[PDB]
Amino acid sequence: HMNITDIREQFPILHQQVNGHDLVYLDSAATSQKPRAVIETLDKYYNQYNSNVHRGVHTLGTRATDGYEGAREKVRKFINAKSMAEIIFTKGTTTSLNMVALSYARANLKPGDEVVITYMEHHANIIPWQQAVKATGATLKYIPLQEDGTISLEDVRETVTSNTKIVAVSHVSNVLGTVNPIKEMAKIAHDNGAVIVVDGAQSTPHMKIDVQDLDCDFFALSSHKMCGPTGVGVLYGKKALLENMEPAEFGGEMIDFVGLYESTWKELPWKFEAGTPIIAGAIGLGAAIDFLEEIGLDEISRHEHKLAAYALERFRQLDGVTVYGPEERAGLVTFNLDDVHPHDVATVLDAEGIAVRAGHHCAQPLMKWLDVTATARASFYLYNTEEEIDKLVEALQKTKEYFTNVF
Amino acid sequence: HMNITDIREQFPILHQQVNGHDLVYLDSAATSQKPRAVIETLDKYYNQYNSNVHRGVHTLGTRATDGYEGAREKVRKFINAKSMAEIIFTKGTTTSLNMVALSYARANLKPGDEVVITYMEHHANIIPWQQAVKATGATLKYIPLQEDGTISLEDVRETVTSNTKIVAVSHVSNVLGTVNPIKEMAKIAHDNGAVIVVDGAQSTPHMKIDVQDLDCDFFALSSHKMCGPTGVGVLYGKKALLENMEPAEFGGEMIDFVGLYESTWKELPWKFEAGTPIIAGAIGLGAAIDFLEEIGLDEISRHEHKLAAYALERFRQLDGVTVYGPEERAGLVTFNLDDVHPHDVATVLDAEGIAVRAGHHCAQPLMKWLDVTATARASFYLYNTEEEIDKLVEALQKTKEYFTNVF
Ligand SMILES: Cc1ncc(COP(=O)(O)O)c(/C=N/[C@@H](C=O)C(=O)O)c1O
Ligand SMILES: Cc1ncc(COP(=O)(O)O)c(/C=N/[C@@H](C=O)C(=O)O)c1O
């Protein structure tokens, strides 16, 4: 099993106080912290072999290249892609999703064509489709949610029709904690001749991903949520789809021949990588993958299952608290105190050393669906403990009392 | 004056051997090395205050935000922009130039409209315009070069007409070393009712930039070329132009309201920053700016003037060597040995510890203009010395002899 003490020892950022209390960092769904192995990877890159990429020029240039392409291979193995040609480094989930919207949607949508999404989608998995449908005169639809905030396959068969070109859905919701039935949704999407686009920002850090088994057409993830550097993400796509898409951006590196007016493109994946790439970040993403793999994604997932069950239980022991979403869930709890604004919850918790987030969580439609204007959220990762969940629930109790007394 | 010994002591990467020789890194135009101050800035971010951005949530979240926005202010002051609203963080020069091509060009070009570029442009400053003209049915033109690879203002007045909508030109060429007359070109562009787009990837690291004085409409730069982290760049644009451009990418952070089908955008600059931003990289870019400013850009520029003059002189002492471009120049020399392929020059130099680059340097049209298929390039920065230029010229001499003897 994973030793949480040994894990925590690897994250320098955890060992500090805020407002005179030990830090309790419960905001990993907004961004995760990094272990020494990742930070030192960046240090070593910049201290030792930084250079632009291109093998066969000079020694540092070769090392930088092998580091960068080596990290591409680590990602390929990590999500079980067939080919490095299917692994594109981007700035993050958002950019990855916009590339599909730009290069895939905008070239394949006619009036009458449908893009189908869901009410629980992050804005990253909403606004690009809004724009693409508007550019092409196509139509945007939403799969409804059940009362507990999961999605039924029946609603999917209903919403998706033989005019659906794209289904775009989150693997795991960053609000509800719902793990969506991606694999069954891809089968439905294909039956109607659609592609499926998976927003995997919240799944990838927390559970094994297998794109062959999921049979997703595209899948997007962010380094910063999975112990990796900021500024880096991945777009996975079926090679046959990427082969037919035009690039989203143009310049050096992604070309083959450049004439005065006309140019040709490199092979995949480089066709989609314009300009000097995110060298250090991608190499650190590779380190983060080595780190998560050595612990075991299955172990991390079990740990989060225990944390989530413990949290849901301790929350149900509190009066005047609503928790949103299903019982089976990823490692997060979005909630509200009756008669306490979530911004205030966050503020008061921070004075107790506790970091949570309050707001829309980039899911305005979902908040509307929940009939709230905002929520608070505690989100967990491999370095969190039950003791920390105790501090959270104890702090929510005191928050209730404190605002009861102000009133 | 700047002490080169004290400067070099700050760059750990310089102090190592390749193939048993002290490293001589002469490839800073491909990418620059980082001082301790920059690396330690990244370390401290990840060790101490990593969190997603948004003030007023939790203490680390506030520190991360102040770090990120504080770096935006450092950039604004660094290039003498009026407003942080004009400073957009991007992945790099390439992405910055594509955003202008996407959001500016594609929305403002009609058949008959001209985009004017030059023969010396990097691909980053070519392919986006190729694509934009093709998307709109507009026309692409090239300002010719003089025999020494500078541009005459007369050719500019000739090429630019009252149908020109955009002039896009490099500040400093990464091949010829030419410093282009940007300020006069902007006056000509405006006289015809065009905007000017400046590719400043090669100028920004090496000389003071003043966007008020240059009167450029847009200006693009890359962190990695100026002692800063990889994966980060800047798009500067006149506020009044950015106000009218639609975003290039969509998602969280860059929105105000999100409805089911329609959304509104945040104010500048956030309108152009979709998704979790490049937090650590931007903060390190700010550190790099603090570092370059403390030394003085003017001092760095003088140092490079001396290095370039010394290099041109020592090169002219070698028989069978052609150097390309003008006498007045930035700190780089692109060249060829008679009867030695530049790839081979690079290879053999690397065995002597010396890092140079060989190839097209992302300037295929310019190579055609030079009537070569490839060149070799030594490029300098604040940490290079004349002793290192001696090793280079001595190594080119031995390369000549060695391939004379092979023959
Ligand atoms: C399901 C899901 N989809 C997209 C994103 C956005 O990813 P990036 O901000 O581009 O790295 C995220 C990350 N969301 C963060 C920040 O917006 C949060 O939940 O606070 C996400 O969880
Ligand atoms: C004048 C000029 N314009 C654009 C670029 C490309 O910037 P990025 O690769 O996107 O950081 C660069 C950087 N060029 C490098 C790499 O392509 C080189 O010259 O080797 C440049 O110098």
Q: What is the token pair recorded at A121?
A: 């989608």
Q: How far is the CA of B92 from the centre of ligand 2 (A)?
A: 9
Cβ separation B255–A61 shorter than 8 A:
no
| Beta bridge partners of residue B24, listed in sequence order | B354
**Chain B residues with CB-CB distance to A43 below 8 A:** 39, 42-43
Tokens standing for residue B205: 């690291």
**Using alpha carbons only, what angle is made at residue A203 by residues A301 and A218, rounded to the nearest 5 degrees?**
140
Distance between B217 CA and the closest CA of chain A, angstroms: 21
| A337: helix, strand or coil | strand
Count CB atoms within 10 A of the CB of residue B94.
32
Residue type, position B143, single letter = I
What letter would DSSP give residue A267? S
Documented resolution in Å: 2.2
Cα-Cα-Cα-Cα dihedral of B155, B160, B162, B165, to 10°? Answer: -170
Q: How far apart are CA A126 and CA A135, in angstroms?
A: 14
> Which atom in ligand 2 lies closest to the alpha carbon of residue B94?
10
Identify which of B252, B279, B343 has the shortest CB distance to residue A124: B252
- Cβ neighbours for A216, distance < 8 A, ≥ 6 positions apart: A182, A186, A196, A197, A198, A236
Residue tagged 């033109």 (tokens): B141
Q: Would you give the distance in Å from CA B379 to the centre of its chain?
A: 13
For residue A122, report the distance from its CA to the centre of ligand 1, in Å: 7
Please identify, by atom number, the ligand 1 atom nearest to the C-alpha of residue A362: 17
Rounded to whole angstroms, how far apart are CA atoms A264 and A262?
7
Q: Give the residue on B whose Cα is nearest the Cα of A349.
A: B58
Q: Which helix (H) or strand (E) holds A115?
A: strand A114-118
For chain B, the C-alpha Rg in angstroms (whole number) is 22
Asked if B173 contacts B325 with a C-beta cutoff of 8 angstroms, the reply is yes
Tokens representing B335 are 């060249």
Residue A179 CA to residue A245 CA, distance in Å, equals: 29
Q: For residue A43, give the nearest of B23, B289, B41, B50 by alpha carbon.
A: B41
CA distance B244 to B239: 9
Can you tell me which residue has the tokens 């660094």?
B78
Residue A105: CA count within 13 A, CB half-sphere: 33
3-state secondary structure of A118: strand
Selected for mutation to probe chain B from A17, A57, A349 (highest B CB count within 10 Å) is A57
CA–CA distance, B188 with B160 (Å, rounded to integer): 8
- Are the beta carbons of A264 and B19 closer than 8 angstroms? no
The answer for residues whose C-beta is within 8 angstroms of residue A168's C-beta and 6 or more apart is A97, A115, A116, A117, A121, A125, A129, A196, A197, A198, A199
Tokens 């139509």 label which residue? A139
Which run of H or E residues covers position A183? helix A182-191
List phi, psi (to 5°) of A359.
140, -155
Helix, strand or coil, per DSSP, at residue A359: strand
Task: Please provide the DSSP assignment of A31-51 as one string.
Answer: -----HHHHHHHHHIIIII--
Instruction: With beta carbons less than 8 A apart as the criterion, state whether A325 and A149 touch.
Output: yes
The reply to whether omega before B128 is within 30° of 0 (cis) is: no
CB atoms closer than 10 angstroms to residue B329? 23
Is the CA virtual torsion A39, A44, A50, A56 positive or negative?
negative
Phi/psi at B222 (nearest 5 deg)? -125, 130
Do residues B218 and B237 make contact, with C-beta atoms less than 8 angstroms apart? Answer: yes
Cis (ω within 30 of 0) for the bond into B269? yes
In this structure, the residues whose C-beta lies within 6 A of any atom of ligand 1 are A 29-30, 92-94, 122, 124-125, 170, 174, 199, 201-202, 222, 224, 357, 361-362; B 52, 252, 275-276
Q: Could you tell me the maximum CA-CA distance found in chain A, to the nearest angstrom? A: 74
Task: Report CA torsion sign: A252, A256, A257, A263.
Answer: negative
- How far A139 CA sits from the closest chain B CA (Å)? 9
Closest protein CA for atom 20 of ligand 1: A30
Sheet holding B375-379, edge to edge: B321-323, B332-337, B375-379, B357-359
CB < 8 Å to B94, chain A: 249, 251-252, 274-276
Ligand nearest to the CA of B231: 2
What is the pairing mode between strands B87-90 and B233-237? antiparallel
CA–chain centroid gap for B375, Å, is 19
Alpha-carbon distances, residue B167 vs A44, B196, B334, B395 (angstroms): 41, 5, 26, 41
For the CA of B362, the nearest atom of ligand 2: 17
- What is the distance between the alpha carbons of residues A276 and A261, in angstroms, rounded to a whole number? 23
- From the list A42, A58, A275, the residue facing B93 with the nearest CB is A275
User: Which backbone phi and psi does B336 adopt, to 5 degrees?
Assistant: -145, 145
Contact across the interface for B224 and A279, Cβ inside 8 Å? yes
CB contact under 8 A, A57 and B140: no
Instruction: Write the CA distances from A367 to A30, A200, B251, integer angstroms.
Output: 17, 20, 16
Tokens of A318: 């509190």
Give the integer Cα–Cα distance in Å for B331 and B53: 38
Alpha-carbon gap, residue B398 to B406, rounded angstroms: 12
B362 as an active site residue: the answer is yes
**Contacts (Cβ under 8 Å, ≥6 apart) of A377:** A27, A29, A175, A332, A333, A334, A335, A356, A357, A358, A361
CA dist A76 and A73 (Å) reads 5
Q: How many CA atoms lie within 13 A of A63 on its CB side?
A: 14
Q: Which of A170, A178, A153 is nearest to A219 (CA)?
A: A170
Distance of CA B63 to the CA centre of its chain: 30
Is the distance from the beta carbon of residue A54 to the nearest atom of ligand 2 less than 6 Å?
no
Give the residue whose CA is nearest to atom 18 of ligand 2. Answer: B30
Bridge partners of B376, per DSSP, are B335, B358
Residue B61 tokens read as 């979240």
Q: Please write down the HEC assignment for all residues of B127-177.
A: HHHHHHHHHHCCEEEEECCCCCCCCCHHHHHHHCCCCEEEEEEECECCCCC
Choose among A59, A35, A214: nearest CA to B349: A59
Which residue's entry shows tokens 């006309």? A262
Q: Which domains does chain A have, with CATH numbers?
A: 2-28+296-406 (no CATH), 35-295 (3.40.640.10)
Sign of CA dihedral B303, B306, B309, B315: negative
Task: Give the Å distance between the CA of A331 and the centre of ligand 1.
Answer: 15
Catalytic residue among B348, B362, B372, B374: B362
**Rounded Cα–Cα distance for residues B199 and A242 (Å):** 29
Residue at token pair 């934009």: B132
Phi, psi of A252 (to 5 degrees): -60, 160
Determine which residue's CA is closest to atom 21 belonging to ligand 1: A201
* Nearest residue by C-alpha to atom 16 in ligand 2: B30
Please give the helix or strand (H or E) that residue B306 lies within, else none. Answer: helix B297-316
Which residue, among B78, B37, B51, has the nearest Cα to B234 in the 3D structure?
B78
DSSP string of B13-78, one letter each residue: GGS-EETTEE-EE-BTTT-----HHHHHHHHHIIIII---S-SSS-HHHHHHHHHHHHHHHHHHHH
DSSP state of A339: T
| Distance between start and end Cα atoms, chain A | 47
- Grouping H, G, I as helix, E, B as strand and the rest as coil, residue B404 is helix
Beta strands in B144-291 (DSSP E): 164-170, 195-199, 218-222, 233-237, 255-258, 263-265
- For B95, the 3-state DSSP assignment is helix
For residue B282, what is the nearest residue in chain A, using CA coordinates? A231
Name the β-bridge partners of B197: B168, B218
What is the least distance, in Å, from the CA of B12 to any CA of chain A?
5
Question: CB B25 to CB A126 under 8 A?
Answer: no
Interchain CB contacts (distance < 8 Å): A and B: 291
The active-site residue, picked from A39, A42, A323, A362, is: A362
d(CA B254, CA A92) in angstroms, rounded, equals 14
- DSSP string of A123-146, one letter each residue: GGGTHHHHHHHHHHT-EEEEEPP-
CA B208-B211-B215 angle, to 5 degrees, is 135
**A360-381 b/e (C-beta count within 10 Å ≥ 16 → b):** bbbbbbbbebbeeebbbbbbbb
| CA–CA distances in Å: residue B211 to residues A193, B97, B116, B283 | 51, 16, 20, 22
**Are B260 and A140 within 8 A, CB to CB?**
yes
Distance CA(B232)–CA(B95), nearest Å, equals: 10
Nearest to A127 by CA among A162, A98, A88, A103: A98
